[PDB]
Amino acid sequence: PVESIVLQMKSMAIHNIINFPFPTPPDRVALSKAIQLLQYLGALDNKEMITEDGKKMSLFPLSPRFSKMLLVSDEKACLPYIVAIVSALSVGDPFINEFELGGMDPELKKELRSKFYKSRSQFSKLDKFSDVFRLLSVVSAMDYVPKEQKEIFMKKNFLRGKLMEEIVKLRKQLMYIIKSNTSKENIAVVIRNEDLKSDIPSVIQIKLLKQMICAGFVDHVAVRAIPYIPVLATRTPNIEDCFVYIHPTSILNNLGEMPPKYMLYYSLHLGGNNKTRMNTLCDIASTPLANIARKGLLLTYSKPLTGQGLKTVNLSPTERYCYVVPRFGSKIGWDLNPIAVHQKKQKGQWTVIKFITRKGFQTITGEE
Amino acid sequence: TRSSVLADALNAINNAEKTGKRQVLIRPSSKVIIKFLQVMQKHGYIGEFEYIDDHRSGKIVVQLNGRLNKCGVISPRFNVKIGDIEKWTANLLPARQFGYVILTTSAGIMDHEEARRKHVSGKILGFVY
Amino acid sequence: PEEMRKRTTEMRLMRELMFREERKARRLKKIKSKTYRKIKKKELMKNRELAADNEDHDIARAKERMTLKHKTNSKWAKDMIKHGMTNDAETREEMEEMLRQGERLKAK
Amino acid sequence: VSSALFFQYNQAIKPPYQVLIDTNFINFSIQKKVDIVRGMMDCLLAKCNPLITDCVMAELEKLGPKYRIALKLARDPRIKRLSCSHKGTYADDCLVHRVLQHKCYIVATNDAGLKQRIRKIPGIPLMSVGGHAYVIEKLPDVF
RNA sequence: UUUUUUUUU
RNA sequence: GUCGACGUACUUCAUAGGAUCA
Numbered sequence: 134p135v136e137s138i139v140l141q142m143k144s145m146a147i148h149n150i151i152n153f154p155f156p157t158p159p160d161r162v163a164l165s166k167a168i169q170l171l172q173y174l175g176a177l178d179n180k181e182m183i184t185e186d187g188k189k190m191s192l193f194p195l196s197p198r199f200s201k202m203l204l205v206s207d208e209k210a211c212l213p214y215i216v217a218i219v220s221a222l223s224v225g226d227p228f229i230n231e232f233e234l235g236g237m238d239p240e241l242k243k244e245l246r247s248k249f250y251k252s253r254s255q256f257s258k259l260d261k262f263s264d265v266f267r268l269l270s271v272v273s274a275m276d277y278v279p280k281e282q283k284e285i286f287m288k289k290n291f292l293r294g295k296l297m298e299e300i301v302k303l304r305k306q307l308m309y310i311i312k313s314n315t316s317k318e319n320i321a322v323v324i325r326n327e328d329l330k331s332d333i334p335s336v337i338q339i340k341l342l343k344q345m346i347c348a349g350f351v352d353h354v355a356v357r358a359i360p361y362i363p364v365l366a367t368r369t370p371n372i373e374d375c376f377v378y379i380h381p382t383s384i385l386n387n388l389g390e391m392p393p394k395y396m397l398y399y400s401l402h403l404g405g406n407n408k409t410r411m412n413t414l415c416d417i418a419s420t421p422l423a424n425i426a427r428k429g430l431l432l433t434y435s436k437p438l439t440g441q442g443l444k445t446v447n448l449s450p451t452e453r454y455c456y457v458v459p460r461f462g463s464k465i466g467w468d469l470n471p472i473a474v475h476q477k478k479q480k481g482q483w484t485v486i487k488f489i490t491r492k493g494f495q496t497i498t499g500e501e
Numbered sequence: 502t503r504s505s506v507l508a509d510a511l512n513a514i515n516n517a518e519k520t521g522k523r524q525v526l527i528r529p530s531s532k533v534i535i536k537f538l539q540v541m542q543k544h545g546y547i548g549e550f551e552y553i554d555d556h557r558s559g560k561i562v563v564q565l566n567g568r569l570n571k572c573g574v575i576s577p578r579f580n581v582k583i584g585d586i587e588k589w590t591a592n593l594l595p596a597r598q599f600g601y602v603i604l605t606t607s608a609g610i611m612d613h614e615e616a617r618r619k620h621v622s623g624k625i626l627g628f629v630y
Numbered sequence: 631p632e633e634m635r636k637r638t639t640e641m642r643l644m645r646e647l648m649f650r651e652e653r654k655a656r657r658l659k660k661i662k663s664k665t666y667r668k669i670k671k672k673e674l675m676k677n678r679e680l681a682a683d684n685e686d687h688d689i690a691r692a693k694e695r696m697t698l699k700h701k702t703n704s705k706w707a708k709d710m711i712k713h714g715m716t717n718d719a720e721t722r723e724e725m726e727e728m729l730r731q732g733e734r735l736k737a738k
Numbered sequence: 739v740s741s742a743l744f745f746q747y748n749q750a751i752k753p754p755y756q757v758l759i760d761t762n763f764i765n766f767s768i769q770k771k772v773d774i775v776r777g778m779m780d781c782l783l784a785k786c787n788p789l790i791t792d793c794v795m796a797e798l799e800k801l802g803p804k805y806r807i808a809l810k811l812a813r814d815p816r817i818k819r820l821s822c823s824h825k826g827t828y829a830d831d832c833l834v835h836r837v838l839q840h841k842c843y844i845v846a847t848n849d850a851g852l853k854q855r856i857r858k859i860p861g862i863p864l865m866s867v868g869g870h871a872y873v874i875e876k877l878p879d880v881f
Numbered sequence: 882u883u884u885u886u887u888u889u890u
Numbered sequence: 891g892u893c894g895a896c897g898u899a900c901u902u903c904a905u906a907g908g909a910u911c912a
């Protein structure tokens with residue numbers, strides 16, 4: 134699909150995009166998906182002009198989603214990590230399978246896979262995260278060691294050979310282009326971001342990383358329950374009742390007792406034994422989905438709900454605090470867990486404003 | 502209508518001490534309520550109390566202090582002979598050596614272990630424990 | 631002044647909010663029909679669990695063992711059992727619900 | 739398999755007895771208005787020495803102030819207080835450990851579950867208030 | 882019940 | 891009269907719930 138192309142040429146603001154002098158006109162479908170997705174990317178609206186952050190996305194040499202997940206992540210110094218992901222996935226096959234290169238010799242092949250598996254386990258500290266945190270910790274250890282000696286390190290755990298010298302080039306390119314757009318060099322703590330190499334991440338900011346990468350992969354959602362999984366990205370209303378499944382090439386191919394139950398993916402493909410392959414995940418549950426599902430028409434609501442401990446309070450005739458359940462699927466979809474949303478009514482609609490938590494709602498219902 | 506004034510008094514004390522209040526107001530107040538209360542007071546179940554006087558039946562205000570588990574009235578004032586003292590105190594007390602059955606004899610209103618000593622009996626009013 | 635007229639329209643809109651809520655609550659108070667109340671309670675417990683420490687559990691277990699309130703020596707249950715009335719499966723639903731609630735309390 | 743026990747006689751239980759009280763023996767005593775010491779005299783027809791364990795007294799003190807009359811009954815001066823070498827755990831567990839470690843107490847209790855778990859252990863008689871008095875089950879010296 | 886040929890900042 | 895309304899006597903139908911394992 135054609136989405137970064139029309140992103141750049143709407144950053145030049147050539148409005149009649151279908152009337153571009155193509156060598157031969159491509160399909161309407163990729164352009165239409167470009168329109169819609171970059172509306173969910175926070176880059177475009179029906180207003181036919183891109184956003185200011187959409188123009189800032191155009192200032193980045195990446196995929197539109199990759200540029201966004203850098204762009205919004207400019208918060209709380211967690212930027213080297215998102216650089217590591219946005220440049221690690223940007224070239225295919227980050228790790229050799231170690232399955233197709235030849236006890237006995239198949240046993241030693243499977244033992245190479247076992248030792249690389251022990252490595253990849255020893256890389257990631259938050260199991261709940263994704264296959265994302267695997268490659269993140271791989272980058273965080275690759276440039277951790279001296280790169281003069283890193284080659285034996287890079288083949289101790291039996292990895293790929295050249296695309297990460299390319300990732301060092303791409304990393305320097307990306308921080309250079311950020312330096313070029315904005316003066317971010319001579320700031321004190323931003324040396325973490327200005328690290329040409331990679332060191333150890335934070336402890337709580339990583340769940341916020343899960344938040345801001347949920348902003349990236351829009352409309353790619355699933356659950357868990359042996360895997361037994363449907364795609365919960367119900368903005369497409371016809372992708373349900375099907376057993377969808379992790380990419381077996383991804384190390385999250387049935388990691389024993391993987392906890393979580395909202396499954397974010399990069400992409401998917403179908404094949405052998407009719408098995409489906411959802412590629413690069415991120416795993417989230419309750420609030421930060423609807424924090425960054427409010428960003429477009431991904432999410433709407435219901436009337437407020439009630440009972441005891443859930444009673445709507447009115448601070449005014451045009452202002453209230455109510456528990457609400459958030460709906461997510463447009464024509465065929467579902468609902469998240471409720472939230473103490475505080476809202477007002479502008480021109481005849483109770484327009485949601487703020488996401489009050491549980492204890493704040495208990496105080497605000499004590500007061501009246 | 503209103504029949505037992507003592508039953509109303511003991512029920513008002515009981516309710517307004519279950520819920521934790523500190524002083525109770527009980528209207529009307531016969532001589533029997535004063536003497537029943539002086540019997541409860543001697544044993545430490547209530548604090549002092551005071552009769553406020555209009556020119557009518559009169560009201561009382563009692564000062565509670567916690568130590569009261571239950572109090573009540575036995576409503577037909579059954580005649581109690583001298584062995585029936587101990588059948589009565591086995592029926593209406595949760596452990597046969599605390600709590601006092603209170604009864605009206607020719608020698609006054611008194612608990613049962615004072616009507617054992619003086620060797621009297623009479624009718625039966627109520628109980629506290 | 632005129633800000634008084636603002637005050638009156640504010641108290642007006644509070645009063646009519648109060649009246650609409652009171653009319654709704656009256657009409658719902660009259661509906662006692664154990665399937666309707668049962669449905670409302672079920673989806674309430676669902677929403678309570680989704681939206682909204684051993685010491686409270688140990689006090690609750692202690693009171694439950696002191697009291698033994700959730701076994702079939704209680705007046706309602708012994709009445710239903712001893713008069714063959716719990717073979718009908720709805721009152722057996724209710725009796726089993728009592729018993730499992732008590733078993734939740736006695737768990738450690 | 740101690741030197742006292744017969745097949746199931748258990749002849750190290752003898753007058754005067756030593757009973758262990760559970761927390762809902764007290765509740766149904768207060769409810770059916772029997773009295774601890776004389777009630778056990780009126781069934782066993784022998785002297786008694788009711789004993790209460792630190793785990794059980796902790797449980798009574800855990801109930802609260804609605805049940806304060808039973809606590810008043812349990813701090814009575816002639817109910818001895820056997821102390822127990824425990825972390826401080828659930829009452830019924832402490833009773834079962836006492837019974838296994840000495841096999842010379844009879845157990846007064848009223849919950850069915852503790853009744854079953856005692857009944858597995860051979861030779862431990864088992865008082866319980868029923869109806870209007872303290873019925874005893876597995877004691878071969880009754881009448 | 883892994884199945885990555887290929888590519889441009 | 892294989893009659894009805896009762897009055898006695900009796901019969902029968904409705905019992906499984908949770909937890910773990912396969």
Ligand SMILES: [Zn+2]
Binds near residue numbers: 822823824826
């Ligand atoms: Zn103990």
